[PDB]
From a paper:
Originally thought to be redundant but distinct decarboxylases, it has been shown that UbiD is in fact the only decarboxylase, whereas UbiX produces a cofactor strictly required for UbiD activity. The UbiX enzyme catalyses both the N5–C1′ and C6–C3′ bond formation to generate the fourth ring of the prFMN product.
In an attempt to further probe the DMAP/DMAPP specificity, and explore the putative role of the (pyro)phosphate in Friedel–Crafts C6-alkylation, we constructed F181Q (to mimic AnUbiX) and F181H (to mimic O157UbiX) PaUbiX variants. Upon reduction of the PaUbiX variant crystals, it was apparent that F181H was able to catalyse prFMN formation. The in crystallo behaviour of both variants is mirrored in solution: F181H is able to form the purple species indicative of the prFMN. semiquinone, while redox cycling of F181Q with DMAP leads to a spectral species with features reminiscent of the DMAP reactions with the DMAPP-specific AnUbiX/EcUbiX. In each variant, the DMAP specificity was retained, and crystal structures of the corresponding complexes with oxidised FMN and DMAP revealed little difference with the WT PaUbiX structure besides the mutations itself. This clearly demonstrates the nature of the residue at position 181 is not the sole determinant of DMAP/DMAPP specificity.
Author numbering:
A (entry chain A), B (entry chain A), C (entry chain A), D (entry chain A), E (entry chain A), F (entry chain A), ...: 1 to 206
Write the structure that this text describes.
């Protein structure tokens, strides 16, 4: 197996709920264990932007997502926003890679300053102190200087700032094609196999 | 008329040629005069990503774009990359707003450092020294710290860093819907009317 | 009409509730549409420092403030602290100027770091990314270096840091006279007519 | 006796002459020795904003202020703006605490840069090099980034930046009540007894 | 009317008195109200470099300049260097744009540090805190790092640093032609009509 | 296999063409796939400093280098300076490590600022945004502060700054021995086996 | 002989071609050897702003300039923009002082960042690393913060930033008089005799 | 005589003992007085890398080096590492230029921080405070960010950072040829004649 066996996937309240759901689906299909976290504002984004009827409490959310993705039992773990006994909350936990997708500007801010106000923010704080992979997927426009300084600080610290900015260079034909471009970039960054985005120039000899 | 009468629209070599073309179309439909600039690498992006057969030389490019957009005579001006006699090259020119869409990381770098190697880069240098509007639309992922520092410097100077990061919160049904979200943000930033992106919460009283 | 048609007026938990109320009154009398936001701590300041019996829920607060100011129907909109569907929460909203008066040091901090924890903080984050006017009215003493660095960062970004520091140079005779000095400065900054603070030296020829 | 026996009280040309006069009165009533300094612009502020007829030359100013405050003989010393033989001008002097109230933005600038152009500015330069207390009471609005950077530099060096921003949380009934709030904060900062501002929550057990 | 109705025009002691006089003439011919300020060192520059016999006291200076420019009564106001009751000294004044032309390196320094030692320096301090236009026209060579850091700080704050560096690209035939180039740039920056500098490339279609 | 299977080897115009050629030879002998890039100025360095008759066009250059190194078919790929369809130009490409050897101060500058003016510079920009290995081998003396700041920025970002500064501590007997020291350091940095530089102190027990 | 025997004189594409030509003339008349470099954009400036018919290729340009200045044979050397075998390209060359006059903002940028894209930029990079004199003569207005930061960086490194800002204090009577002021400043900076600008106050005893 | 009459030559513990010895030889042949200093670690480098049997104590080391170089009596002075009475230890000494060749990263660090732990480090501290020439010849690879920041600080202060990075552009045929390139660069930097490195392009006319 290439790439991390366990991924902490946090969804926070920026537009782009489809990116998180599609990423979750691909992680499940690659037989990865996913520790799934979702903020209160992200739950509202999902209700506004999609037809997914995501249950509110973690136990029922875990059942729903398992059915939605066709995951194995225990493959998707769901942890609530104040569950400090969950693996992502401590560096003594087993190593995960972490993705925040979408990453709201508020969560971006909290991770940059170390606010640790909820399990998503603490889990990123832990990823940085343990030097485990951390990928942030912001979705905002314009990016203000406040946004950019927070992204730059975290990038300087080794976090990967991967904006939800799909490329158009494989003739996209649908919204789903654009979503897949970003999801493929994330999987590439994590080192996890994907077949949605070809290897640029791989056939190009001279 | 709300917003600028004249817009310098530069296209540079990031993916997202559709954003530039659609923005050009909307500017024409709003009866704006457009000074159109396109880099050599952007011409290659357009040939790779779209079915637009854009002529190479400025005179023929100007004819093509006028037909493509249904523009009036002289409404679209095309200037070549070393035409230092064109309006965008001097601050003594008449005031324009400027948009670089897409904005490659190379053009982002040149504007941040003041390289002024071609008319697109000099025109942005002029926009900054004259404190005229400058909007950059980067399309890249991940954003490295090199990218982010250049974006932050320019944002601190008053340029608008508007990444090609479409929002999903008006139920997009096609690639064109996502393109329009970004194009609408640009038009909003310039203060030019648009009807593709509703005013959020405008009906919301309490 | 001079100045902004719509103003987001946020009250947060620093002493000086009278400044916010008087500013709200003047905005109403200038026929401006006001999107009114108030933090939980500010509600407690108002109960401690004034005899205003402000209702707690937005619907009833909106009724009360309309009566208090003699506003027209719909002229004052009240939005709760987690109402992400309200206009101030998105840059795709119609343009407002924004004033935080009083601005607590906690809200000052959140805006400086981009925390976006509630609608007041997100609305300021949106004002900065859209380059729409943002005026902060802190009331604190001493200002620590933590306070000052946050004020300096935001001032460098174009926010107006307007401390609740009334001037004495028009022979004030009451608390209300000192309140009006600050409120007049805010209206001047927004470009909205006021007749409480004369134009200094306007009659002075030589 | 709690707090400093000797206080250098400098008045400079910001609005708020009443704060300086009331502070001088309270220092006298607490039996402190006051080295009183006043700038040329502050003399003009006092003539504009109050009915105090302050004599111009130090000898007569010293007589007037002694009568005004009911001070003992020699309790108030007045020194002119170029009197480099006065105690405040040398660090070899006996230790004083220093307050500049009001502190103009020009005096703020001079102290931040070390300009030492007059006795007020040199005395503050001496307070900083000897690490003796220095309290600045600016009165300005907006604070520009120039103001804020100067305040931040001095706060980082241990000066207390105490803006003339009265609090409203003890039901003020007059201009004098608001003046007293700021004067009480200054006395608190110096460690000198005052009974104008109660100790917040002192009776609050749980 | 395009551009500001009122302009504060300060002349300080760099070489280039002709620029200030010609700018004053053009502002008068565009029917603008001018608040004219001149430093002691600038008066000496004018006596050294020109044949203008400028009276020393403001009242007589105001009479002379009115005759010199052919201005209407009250169109040119002259204020002395310590006239703190003049409009430029307070932000509560009516809005002006401000130009310092020529701008000595000493006045550049004072504005960068906030020294506010005279009415010219305070008026610029007020322009910055009120975010009203401020244009500085330095004339010096070489620019030292001290000069450049002061110019950069002020440019970062939104002041326009416009050096007296005339362009040669409209075939200048006299000293007056070079003066007019700089004066035209200033008028362009203020948004005030001028016909001395053509709009570059305005006729250039492709 | 230890170390990267694919290496992008860029040669740019600093003295030390022998280092690049010898590194290319060792990579081939370790059965690595090499994507070979060479700048116009580097071609001139090679003609000036060596007797290698390197063909100019990529197709013929690829034939020559394959013969020169005894490489397998397709093992060395050559890409021209504007071939944006080559793998190194996009982060969606398959992962490579990248070495610029020699690295001119001009290419050092471009990578530090993100200029992306040609395929070598873009490929390094891509290596940094994808956090793939990037090794720069500058050859210059003195290093100016411009050089050093660019090297420091890139080192802080995780690029390896490996100057062409051979060590003398294995009794070098020829120019080739000194070349091999640097080439061995590069291979060590990449994690690729080499037998030219012994493991220091490997036999040293106490 | 006072001052440098050899001067590298680079002309780049800012307005002010007359300054470069007049400086070249004075260097020739002082019997200095001049290594003359001119950018493509500067050639266009010279054709636009003057009646000098400068040949394009270096050999013919060298003949023309020798006749134009009345120079001795070999006294003016002309080198093309990619002639890396010319003395200015290597620090191992014989010591020259270097002047870029006019210095475009693009060349200013390249020297500040170390871009070294052509012989002019590399020659300045070499002057800085060898700590040989480097004088830049920018001609631009306004100077943006991008311009100013580049000038400040280079000034901090010991380059002389000498803007084309002529002084008026020797009663100039023509364009040529203003040109000579700047040219005289450059010669003063290089330590080369000139008689166009008197020594200020040289006769002034007390 | 061109260049300094007296040179402090310090050898510290980086590889490249041959550079120091060859530089010492050339300084002697140019009839310069050399104050020779060598660290304990450098003595070990010399024993490891060369066949020079350098005596340990200064008196015998001075005899050996005089014979080795064929120096005149008293032409080479040797001072021990704690000889604070030696000329290099005080700025009141007669002016020397100073070279540290090789310069270990430890000595680089000490000079950058001012550690002054031995005579070599103090002598460099003295060279910097007296603004006398200081040339550092580091030999290390990779350069870490710790190395680079120390080199940048010292370069900004006017020290010459000259890495042991020989050039290959005069067809080197032996180790000695590469050593001579670096030694020639050092002599060039000091302004001392050398005939090992030709003047680049000196014969190149056009
Ligand atoms: C509920 C909500 C919140 C949006 C929002 C919307 C919704 C429905 C949309 C989808 C209609 C439009 C855009 N949204 C974005 C957004 N923040 C952001 O950084 N990017 C966004 O694209 N916000 C605000 C963000 O959710 C708030 O600032 C939260 O405080 C974030 O909290 P969290 O980090 O804990 O999720
Ligand atoms: C030709 C080409 C260049 C791409 C590229 C592609 C093509 C076809 C695609 C479309 C297949 C994939 C992505 N592209 C991007 C890109 N640079 C960038 O910042 N974002 C991009 O999305 N690059 C590189 C960029 O064009 C180069 O760095 C140019 O030097 C930019 O030059 P310019 O600023 O003058 O346009
Ligand atoms: C309830 C409360 C909070 C005061 C306070 C008081 C009250 C009654 C007063 C009125 C008696 C005295 C002073 N107050 C101030 C204050 N914060 C501040 O920056 N300036 C103040 O003047 N605070 C604290 C501030 O409200 C808290 O730090 C909140 O967390 C701010 O939260 P908010 O930004 O969401 O309003
Ligand atoms: C005379 C004068 C000067 C005012 C002023 C007024 C007057 C009458 C008022 C009272 C009508 C309105 C406001 N004033 C302020 C002010 N500077 C400042 O920082 N805050 C102020 O509130 N200024 C300007 C300030 O006095 C000048 O910049 C002086 O140079 C300060 O010099 P100083 O530090 O030596 O006192
Ligand atoms: C009187 C005087 C002062 C010159 C000067 C001359 C004169 C006659 C000239 C005209 C002969 C030559 C050049 N001048 C300049 C100059 N300062 C400057 O920045 N640029 C200049 O070009 N100075 C110095 C400047 O005037 C002093 O530093 C003043 O202190 C500035 O004070 P101010 O800002 O209040 O005007
Ligand atoms: C042609 C050429 C260019 C040399 C040069 C020489 C040649 C023959 C030598 C070999 C004779 C001597 C030294 N060279 C160096 C050099 N730049 C550098 O950083 N280190 C060097 O050692 N330069 C300059 C460098 O090539 C230019 O600045 C190019 O613009 C670099 O462009 P590139 O990065 O695209 O290759
Ligand atoms: C051809 C051209 C280019 C001008 C220009 C004009 C012309 C005719 C004028 C003379 C009509 C007006 C002003 N010019 C200036 C200018 N750049 C600058 O920094 N200052 C200037 O004054 N520019 C732009 C500058 O030449 C470009 O940015 C080039 O890329 C510079 O390239 P270079 O550094 O290699 O010369
Ligand atoms: C004895 C010794 C020390 C080497 C070393 C070796 C030896 C034999 C070699 C020659 C086998 C290989 C490389 N050497 C280097 C080195 N430090 C350095 O900056 N560059 C080097 O090339 N070091 C370490 C350096 O000498 C130590 O860090 C000392 O503390 C430096 O002390 P000094 O500055 O007082 O001389
Ligand atoms: Na917390
Ligand atoms: Na250029
Ligand atoms: Na939050
Ligand atoms: Na002084
Ligand atoms: Na002052
Ligand atoms: Na480019
Ligand atoms: Na280059
Ligand atoms: Na020590």
């Amino acid at each position: 197996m290439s790439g991390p066996e366990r991924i902490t996937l946090a969804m926070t309240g920026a537009s782009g709920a489809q990116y998180g759901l599609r990423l979750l689906d691909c992680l499940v299909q690659e037989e990865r264990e996913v520790h799934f976290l979702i903020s209160k504002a992200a739950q509202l984004v999902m209700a506004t932007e999609t037809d997914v009827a995501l249950p509110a409490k973690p136990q029922a959310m875990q059942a729903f997502l398992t059915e939605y993705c066709g995951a194995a039992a225990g493959q998707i773990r769901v942890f609530g926003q104040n569950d400090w006994m969950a693996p992502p909350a401590s560096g003594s936990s087993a190593p995960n890679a972490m993705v925040i997708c979408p990453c709201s500007t508020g969560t971006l801010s909290a991770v940059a300053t170390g606010a640790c106000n909820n399990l998503i923010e603490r889990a990123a704080d832990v990823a940085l102190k343990e030097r485990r992979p951390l990928v942030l997927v912001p979705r905002e426009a314009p990016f203000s200087s406040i946004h950019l300084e927070n992204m730059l600080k975290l990038s300087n610290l080794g976090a990967v700032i991967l904006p939800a900015a799909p490329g158009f260079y494989h003739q996209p034909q649908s919204v789903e094609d654009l979503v897949d471009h970003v999801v493929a970039r994330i999987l590439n960054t994590l080192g996890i196999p994907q077949d949605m985005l070809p290897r640029w120039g791989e056939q190009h000899l001279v």
